[PDB]
Write a protein that binds this DNA or RNA. Structure first.
Lengths: 67, 213, 136, 101, 25
RNA sequence: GCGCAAGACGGACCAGAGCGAAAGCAUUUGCCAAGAAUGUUUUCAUUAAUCAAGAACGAAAGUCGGAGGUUCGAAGACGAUCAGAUACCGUCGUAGUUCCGACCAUAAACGAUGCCGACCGGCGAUGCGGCGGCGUUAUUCCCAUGACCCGCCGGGCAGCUUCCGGGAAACCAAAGUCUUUGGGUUCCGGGGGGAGUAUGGUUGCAAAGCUGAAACUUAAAGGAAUUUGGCGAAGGGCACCACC
């Protein structure tokens, strides 16, 4: 790898539909605090809401669908 | 096992004198060693550069091919090789419910430069036209193609490469084709899409320094 | 491998041919003429499973490695030359071109003109497969 | 029984047309029978266009588009969710689905 | 059985009976 | 990335558009012959329609003799898949695929709908030729030609609607003008199998093509449409006797 990626803390703005085979995960529109202009979509697993901060280990991936 | 990029030299390329932006970029080649020389390795190199990066304020969907032929020390001197249009513009011009016209010649300049030209013409819908198709008959297409062929022929046999490249920087041939073909069937998108080069004469240095100053 | 040129005033250009089929992606960087090359890592180089060699992850890692090598040698500005498998097979680019381009732009370089150079045939030979196609 | 006024194609006074090849498949389908789809797309999506624009030499640069024509066989088009079956009284609708978005 | 392969088997029986008839002359 | 060589093909433009008796036909230019429709106050004057015998053309595959063989690819050689897989899938690959010269006359050769002629509703477009009319353009004036616009006429590929009418219905402006049954003419079918089979003749180098039965056996085989049901069919929702 030879890459120590810095961790990113990001805050959600809205909750999209629940993807997955059995609906275990959901899609959110999440935005960063260090740059409050960049907004990406992520697939998050677990009970989420509007306002919780997610710890992203990488910030350069875009959300895949259920398959 | 050794780094092969430690024995490279960064050269520079220069456009010929009819272009505004003289400096294009940097290309690199290995150092001279024995029989092979860095002068020969920069010989057959063709550069695909856009017109917007070689001129100041013109169309961005035009590209010119430049090939090096001699080097004078950290400066590669180029010459005109070919012309082509960008793929997105050529694909966006071609649309359904219109017919497109192709013509080509094998016209030769006043020196030993044999060129092959290509162009294109698409039919124009009128402003108050209610009809959808607006096609062209075969005899009108033949007359328009002959008109295009003679306009291609008339602008090249009395010129050499310099002022015909100066004419190829705008679409003056395209405007002349569109103006001349208005009495046959009105066209609206006429661009010289491809210029090739078949035959090249013996290499003369004097014309190269006259083409660079 | 050093160069005494200016860096603040202008930038050094190269071109990058991104070839992306449905089973492998290529990130190939040459000079302006294209004869001399700089670096290449394929999408099968990063992931060790040959199932998802055309994955966005492997294209992202390959583009990041290519950008790191290009910053190591000293290429800052880059012209994108996009190509699919072409021919008579298909013309849609594979599933790593956009991810590789976004990873290459996000790495901290400058992007010039994006060009599609996939080979478009003018009625070439017969496509591989029968008259009924590949039934499966 | 006869299902359609035409024969699933657009041949009326010809008798023979040139065949084309499917893109998802390799079946030899006639040109006027195959479901054609001219799709236009940008090189980047709506998420990466900002990342391309912030890392561009030219300010106010127009992103190019990608032009490709797709030829589909009937089973390939119905299995890729391009066209589906509909009612007997709704089969004679000629207009495409609306271009709202 | 579809008519195509029954016609093919019928033609093979034609070939066998024709060969047997012409070799039993 | 720069060049060389070989063969095949003519994308996008390309359409419920055109031509041809059908099979079929898509780069540019040149040569030769042919054809439909439109226009005609031209010419002959019944020369016409359909067709046993006979005759030309005729997809792909197949045969014989040459040149050439890029790609694809029957037979074949393997690798997976599977209980088996001499199948689907993947890598090679012979005849063939291409051209010339000579053969067969076969397709779901389908509009599954013979040809000529007459009559019976409406509408909007389309390709050709001719005619008329306000305006715009090939830069400002006039005329003619091209390009638009509004209409008429004839032929042609077609479309929408219809208590015309028909039909078992699907549907058809013909599949209508049919018990109120007769415009002219050629071919062809009498329940389902045996069977396009036996034999005879005939054509072909061959593969095969045309003509074409009977014994025996059977009470059904089929066409259109409605309801249920089940789809490894599609579109919406639900269930901890389903899942996460």
């Amino acid at each position: 790898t030879s890459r120590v990626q810095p961790i990113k803390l990001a805050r959600v703005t809205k909750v999209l539909g629940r993807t997955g085979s059995q609906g275990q995960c959901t899609q959110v529109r999440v935005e960063f605090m260090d740059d409050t202009s960049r907004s990406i979509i992520r697939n998050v697993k677990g009970p989420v809401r509007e306002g919780d901060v997610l710890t992203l280990l990488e910030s350069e991936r875009e959300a895949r669908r259920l398959r | 096992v050794v780094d092969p990029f430690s024995k490279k030299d960064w050269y520079d390329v220069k456009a010929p004198a009819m272009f505004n932006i003289r400096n294009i970029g940097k290309t690199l080649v290995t150092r001279t060693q024995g029989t092979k020389i860095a002068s020969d390795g920069l010989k057959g190199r063709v550069f695909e550069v856009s017109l917007a990066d070689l001129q100041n304020d013109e169309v961005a969907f035009r590209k010119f091919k430049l090939i090096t032929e001699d080097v004078q020390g950290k400066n590669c001197l180029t010459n005109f090789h070919g012309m082509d249009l960008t793929r997105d513009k050529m694909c966006s011009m071609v649309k359904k419910w219109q017919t497109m016209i192709e013509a080509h010649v094998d016209v030769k300049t006043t020196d030993g430069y044999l060129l092959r030209l290509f162009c294109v013409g698409f039919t124009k819908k009128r402003n108050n036209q209610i009809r959808k198709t607006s096609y062209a008959q075969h005899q009108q297409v033949r007359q328009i193609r002959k008109k295009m062929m003679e306009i291609m022929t008339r602008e090249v046999q009395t010129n050499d490469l310099k002022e015909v490249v100066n004419k190829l920087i705008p679409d003056s041939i395209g405007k002349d084709i569109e103006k001349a073909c208005q009495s046959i069937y009105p066209l609206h998108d006429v661009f010289v899409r491809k210029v090739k080069m078949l035959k090249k004469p013996k290499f003369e240095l004097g014309k190269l320094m006259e083409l660079h100053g | 491998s050093l160069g005494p040129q200016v860096a603040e005033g202008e930038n050094v250009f190269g071109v990058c041919h991104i070839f992306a089929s449905f089973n492998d992606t290529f990130v190939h960087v040459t000079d302006l003429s294209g004869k001399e090359t700089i670096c290449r890592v394929t999408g099968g180089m990063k992931v060790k499973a040959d199932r998802d060699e055309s994955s966005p992850y492997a294209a992202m890692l390959a583009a990041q490695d290519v950008a790191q090598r290009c910053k190591e040698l000293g290429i800052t500005a880059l012209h994108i030359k996009l190509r699919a498998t072409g021919g008579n097979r298909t013309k849609t680019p594979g599933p790593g071109a956009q991810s590789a381009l976004r990873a290459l732009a996000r790495s901290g370089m400058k992007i010039g003109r994006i060009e599609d150079v996939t080979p478009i045939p003018s009625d070439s030979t017969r496509r591989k497969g029968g008259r009924r196609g590949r039934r499966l | 029984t006869k299902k359609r006024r035409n024969n699933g194609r657009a041949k009326k006074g010809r008798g023979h047309v040139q065949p084309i090849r499917c893109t998802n498949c390799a079946r030899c389908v006639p040109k006027d029978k195959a479901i054609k789809k001219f799709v236009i797309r940008n090189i980047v999506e709506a998420a990466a266009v900002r990342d391309i624009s912030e890392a561009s030499v030219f300010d106010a640069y127009v992103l190019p588009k990608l032009y490709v024509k797709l030829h589909y066989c009937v089973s390939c088009a119905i299995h890729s969710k391009v066209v589906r079956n509909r009612s007997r009284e709704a089969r004679k609708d000629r207009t495409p689905p609306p271009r709202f978005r | 059985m579809r008519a195509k392969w029954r016609k093919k088997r019928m033609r093979r029986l034609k070939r066998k009976r024709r060969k047997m008839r012409q070799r039993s002359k």
